[PDB]
Amino acid sequence: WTATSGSCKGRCFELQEVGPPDCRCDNLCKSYSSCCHDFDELCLKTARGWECTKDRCGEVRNEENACHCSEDCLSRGDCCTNYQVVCKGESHWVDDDCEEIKVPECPAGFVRPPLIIFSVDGFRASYMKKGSKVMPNIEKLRSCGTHAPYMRPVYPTKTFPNLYTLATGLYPESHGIVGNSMYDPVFDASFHLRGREKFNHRWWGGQPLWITATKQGVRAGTFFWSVSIPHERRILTILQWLSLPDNERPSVYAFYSEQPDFSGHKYGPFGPEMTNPLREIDKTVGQLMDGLKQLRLHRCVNVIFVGDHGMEDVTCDRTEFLSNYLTNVDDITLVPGTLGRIRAKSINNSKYDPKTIIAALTCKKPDQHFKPYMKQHLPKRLHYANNRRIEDIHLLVDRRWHVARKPLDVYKKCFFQGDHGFDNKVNSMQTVFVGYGPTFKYRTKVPPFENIELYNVMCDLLGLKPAPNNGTHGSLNHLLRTNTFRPTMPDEVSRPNYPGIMYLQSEFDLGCTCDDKVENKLEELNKRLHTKGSTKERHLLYGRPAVLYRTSYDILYHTDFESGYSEIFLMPLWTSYTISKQAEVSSIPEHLTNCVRPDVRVSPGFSQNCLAYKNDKQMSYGFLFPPYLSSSPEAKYDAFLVTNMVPMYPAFKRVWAYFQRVLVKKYASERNGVNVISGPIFDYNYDGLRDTEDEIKQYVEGSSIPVPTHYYSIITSCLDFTQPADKCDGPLSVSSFILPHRPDNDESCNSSEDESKWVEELMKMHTARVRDIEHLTGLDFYRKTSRSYSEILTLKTYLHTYESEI
Numbered sequence: 001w002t003a004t005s006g007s008c009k010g011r012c013f014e015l016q017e018v019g020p021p022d023c024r025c026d027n028l029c030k031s032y033s034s035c036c037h038d039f040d041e042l043c044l045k046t047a048r049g050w051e052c053t054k055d056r057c058g059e060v061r062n063e064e065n066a067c068h069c070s071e072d073c074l075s076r077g078d079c080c081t082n083y084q085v086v087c088k089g090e091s092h093w094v095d096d097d098c099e100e101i102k103v104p105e106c107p108a109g110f111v112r113p114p115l116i117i118f119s120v121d122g123f124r125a126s127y128m129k130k131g132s133k134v135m136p137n138i139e140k141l142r143s144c145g146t147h148a149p150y151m152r153p154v155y156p157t158k159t160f161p162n163l164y165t166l167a168t169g170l171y172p173e174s175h176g177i178v179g180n181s182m183y184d185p186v187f188d189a190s191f192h193l194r195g196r197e198k199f200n201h202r203w204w205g206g207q208p209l210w211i212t213a214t215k216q217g218v219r220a221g222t223f224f225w226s227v228s229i230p231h232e233r234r235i236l237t238i239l240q241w242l243s244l245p246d247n248e249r250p251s252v253y254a255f256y257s258e259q260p261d262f263s264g265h266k267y268g269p270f271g272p273e274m275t276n277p278l279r280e281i282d283k284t285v286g287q288l289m290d291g292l293k294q295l296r297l298h299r300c301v302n303v304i305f306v307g308d309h310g311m312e313d314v315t316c317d318r319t320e321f322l323s324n325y326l327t328n329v330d331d332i333t334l335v336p337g338t339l340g341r342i343r344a345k346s347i348n349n350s351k352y353d354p355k356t357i358i359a360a361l362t363c364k365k366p367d368q369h370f371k372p373y374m375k376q377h378l379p380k381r382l383h384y385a386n387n388r389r390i391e392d393i394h395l396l397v398d399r400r401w402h403v404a405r406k407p408l409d410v411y412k413k414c415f416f417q418g419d420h421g422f423d424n425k426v427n428s429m430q431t432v433f434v435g436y437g438p439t440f441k442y443r444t445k446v447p448p449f450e451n452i453e454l455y456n457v458m459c460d461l462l463g464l465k466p467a468p469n470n471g472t473h474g475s476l477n478h479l480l481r482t483n484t485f486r487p488t489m490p491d492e493v494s495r496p497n498y499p500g501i502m503y504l505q506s507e508f509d510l511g512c513t514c515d516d517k518v519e520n521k522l523e524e525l526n527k528r529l530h531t532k533g534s535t536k537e538r539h540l541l542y543g544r545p546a547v548l549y550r551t552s553y554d555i556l557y558h559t560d561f562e563s564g565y566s567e568i569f570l571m572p573l574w575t576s577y578t579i580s581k582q583a584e585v586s587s588i589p590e591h592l593t594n595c596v597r598p599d600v601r602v603s604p605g606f607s608q609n610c611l612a613y614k615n616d617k618q619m620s621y622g623f624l625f626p627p628y629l630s631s632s633p634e635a636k637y638d639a640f641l642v643t644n645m646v647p648m649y650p651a652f653k654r655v656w657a658y659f660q661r662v663l664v665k666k667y668a669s670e671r672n673g674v675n676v677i678s679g680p681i682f683d684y685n686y687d688g689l690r691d692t693e694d695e696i697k698q699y700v701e702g703s704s705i706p707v708p709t710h711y712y713s714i715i716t717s718c719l720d721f722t723q724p725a726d727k728c729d730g731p732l733s734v735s736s737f738i739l740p741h742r743p744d745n746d747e748s749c750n751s752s753e754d755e756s757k758w759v760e761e762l763m764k765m766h767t768a769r770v771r772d773i774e775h776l777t778g779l780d781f782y783r784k785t786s787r788s789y790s791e792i793l794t795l796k797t798y799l800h801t802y803e804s805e806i
């Protein structure tokens with residue numbers, strides 16, 4: 001019930017929302033069907049439109065008008081935004097030359113530069129260049145401020161998950177808005193874009209910027225806008241709030257545009273119909289900036305112009321139907337479109353089986369345009385699993401396509417030409433970032449970054465402590481003139497043991513054999529030196545990784561590689577090695593094919609054993625430092641130590657062996673040497689964070705050897721590739737992966753072919769940030785470089801995407 005008989009007199013766009021049944025006059029009252037009876041009359045005036053004209057100048061105030069052109073309008077804070085241009089001979093902001101804003105130039109009584117976030121739905125990154133001729137205001141913000149060539153959204157690349165990620169710095173799996181449509185099985189409730197369930201607070205996790213601000217005594221404008229409020233009124237409302245007395249005036253504001261997404265869905269991302277929506281958005285930006293200029297705030301406020309996601313060409317005919325694959329299509333519920341999510345239609349159906357659904361959807365048609373995954377097997381960079389609102393079965397849909405359950409869903413539930421939602425590395429889904437104002441840099445281009453980083457920066461711009469989030473605070477310090485956040489490296493928690501030779505060969509009963517009893521004061525001192533760390537500067541180039549949790553581990557040195565060996569997990573946490581451009585690949589010699597060697601520095605009780613692998617008919621083994629890249633026949637023996645061995649399914653060994661034998665050398669050739677750190681990952685509860693020992697679900701049969709769910713590598717070289725990786729004077733360059741450790745290659749439909757035709761494709765799909773590996777391992781990398789820590793934070797957030805140029 002709403003008692004709509006109250007009034008909006010002196011309450012239009014009030015900031016504190018009133019509770020039912022009292023009627024509302026706020027930004028969202030229309031969305032709740034709750035506005036007072038006179039809200040339209042008083043708060044949505046339209047008379048005489050939005051622009052001053054010559055004959056209106058100095059008019060007698062008429063309170064009915066949508067905006068004013070009378071002499072008193074500046075003191076009232078309600079002139080039309082072009083008032084000074086039309087009536088007082090001023091220029092439009094867009095016509096003024098750009099001039100650096102070295103310090104805030106703010107009116108008396110301003111405690112901090114306000115922040116205005118201007119968000120645009122469906123604003124594909126390439127519109128900044130492609131549309132630049134029709135967007136002069138936006139192009140000025142872009143060229144004069146700080147801009148990225150594109151900003152990466154979160155998956156899925158849908159509006160509500162991305163707006164709420166912008167607000168919170170959280171992945172959707174953590175903030176809980178994992179789609180525009182959701183079912184939560186604990187609430188037994190459904191969330192939809194249409195209707196009332198979405199306003200319930202139980203869906204919205206984390207702490208969004210407006211709450212962070214309010215809790216710390218910084219007043220916020222209402223961020224949300226009912227779709228029917230025209231954009232001109234939204235801007236005039238912001239501008240009126242900026243005229244409030246100091247004690248009443250917000251310091252942070254948001255505008256949102258439903259364009260260009262609205263037209264993009266109808267016309268495609270580059271339909272000829274798209275130029276007009278881009279012009280209209282640019283006109284709105286001009287209204288804001290002219291309005292700020294009238295208020296003498298245009299060199300005071302920080303403005304962020306930011307998008308939620310891009311837009312791709314998608315038409316009805318490019319739809320895959322689950323009814324062409326499944327016998328049981330009526331026993332499943334599908335959340336359809338540019339991603340698929342499947343669960344049982346009925347929890348009482350005991351014949352429902354996810355394994356048979358996945359198999360029926362796997363590599364069934366030659367050009368199949370989606371791929372099924374259990375959610376824990378999705379690329380870890382998506383961070384899309386740890387939430388009960390995310391169904392166990394996920395379909396990753398190829399760009400330009402849709403998946404649906406049955407054909408009747410697509411013609412009885414063809415008009416549209418654009419959509420979005422795909423994998424967040426796809427070029428068409430990239431969106432925009434420009435920052436302009438005293439706190440941002442002047443005429444500065446920054447590399448692409450992820451939208452999870454922006455909450456921390458918005459907190460920095462407002463002097464707020466951010467709530468715990470998934471950004472890496474300091475990684476965006478290079479966007480800022482001032483207000484940088486200068487963190488300190490985390491403290492190492494566990495220090496390593498440095499074991500020497502402490503065990504005789506006969507103390508070991510591991511079931512291993514090696515033909516290494518084939519046998520000098522000159523060369524023996526030399527090899528003792530290698531076991532002591534004499535080559536460690538060549539192979540550990542950025543310092544030892546720090547271990548950020550409590551554990552027992554040993555540093556083990558070798559001619560060609562260094563490792564941190566866990567006594568608890570019985571394998572290395574990390575293995576580090578450098579491969580120069582001139583490095584030679586060799587074979588594993590015949591007599592060494594089955595060689596595994598006890599490590600006399602590590603007790604039998606803390607070692608793996610070969611007998612467990614013999615007995616486990618599903619499990620084989622690989623090595624973390626590859627025997628193929630040994631520096632010499634004698635050094636190669638080190639690579640067969642039991643302390644370099646890790647459990648690997650034979651299907652996975654196909655992948656790993658190709659990476660090690662072929663790809664490492666290729667990268668060294670292409671990058672002028674590489675440094676490689678590789679290791680296992682254990683994430684059995686798919687929360688993106690290192691498992692403790694009691695979370696491990698699988699072991700090598702009969703043993704305490706834990707099976708990794710993933711294997712990583714971090715491949716680092718000199719950004720200036722004219723210098724070798726091991727003699728690099730300046731910035732670094734990195735690419736990483738987190739490969740799923742699976743007992744089949746069903747993910748790769750072409751895996752019956754030679755590894756040259758499918759393995760690198762798999763590795764690209766599973767590209768990762770160093771930061772993703774840090775979460776998953778509790779390790780902290782790049783501890784010892786000569787680079788600034790914020791520079792290293794940016795490096796750690798880099799994602800190598802393998803998409804061609806935007």
Ligand SMILES: *[C@@H]1O[C@H](CO)[C@@H](O[C@@H]2O[C@H](CO)[C@@H](O[C@@H]3O[C@H](CO[C@H]4O[C@H](CO)[C@@H](O)[C@H](O[C@H]5O[C@H](CO)[C@@H](O)[C@H](O)[C@@H]5O[C@H]5O[C@H](CO)[C@@H](O)[C@H](O)[C@@H]5O)[C@@H]4O)[C@@H](O)[C@H](O[C@H]4O[C@H](CO)[C@@H](O)[C@H](O)[C@@H]4O[C@H]4O[C@H](CO)[C@@H](O)[C@H](O)[C@@H]4O)[C@@H]3O)[C@H](O)[C@H]2NC(C)=O)[C@H](O)[C@H]1NC(C)=O
Nearest residue numbers: 173174175176204205206386387388468469470687688775
């Ligand atoms: C991205 O950044 C975020 C933010 O930093 C990281 O997320 C944090 O991760 C922590 C570890 O997973 C987690 O810490 C836990 O918090 C529990 C208390 O949680 C509540 O309070 C906080 C603070 O206000 C709040 O934010 C939480 O909000 C979550 O839950 C509600 C309701 O479901 C949602 O609306 C909201 O969206 C959010 O959900 C998300 O996180 C939860 C986990 O909390 C997931 O389940 C959801 O899927 C979703 O992803 C909560 O309201 C606390 O109780 C936990 O403590 C247990 O474990 C510790 C181990 O240290 C142990 O000492 C305790 O005894 C305790 O164990 C007991 O409970 C167990 C489980 O029932 C049981 O098995 C035991 O036997 C014991 O009884 C724990 O400290 C923190 O909450 C989240 N925060 C957020 C916002 O998500 C995220 O990790 C980052 N991602 C990456 C990849 O780095």
Ligand SMILES: CC(C)(C)c1cc(S(C)(=O)=O)cc(-c2ccc(Cl)cc2)n1
Nearest residue numbers: 117160163164166167223224225254256
């Ligand atoms: C997704 C929610 C409902 C929380 C939402 C709605 C709207 S709306 C379309 O304008 O109602 C705007 C924003 C918003 C979030 C973050 C940022 Cl930085 C700016 C704006 N968020």
Ligand SMILES: [Ca+2]
Nearest residue numbers: 683689690691
């Ligand atoms: Ca985990």
Ligand SMILES: [Cl-]
Nearest residue numbers: 509510511512
């Ligand atoms: Cl043995």
Ligand code: NA
Nearest residue numbers: 613616619620
């Ligand atoms: Na085996």
Ligand code: NA
Nearest residue numbers: 745746748751
């Ligand atoms: Na396959």
Ligand SMILES: [Zn+2]
Nearest residue numbers: 122261265420
């Ligand atoms: Zn859309």
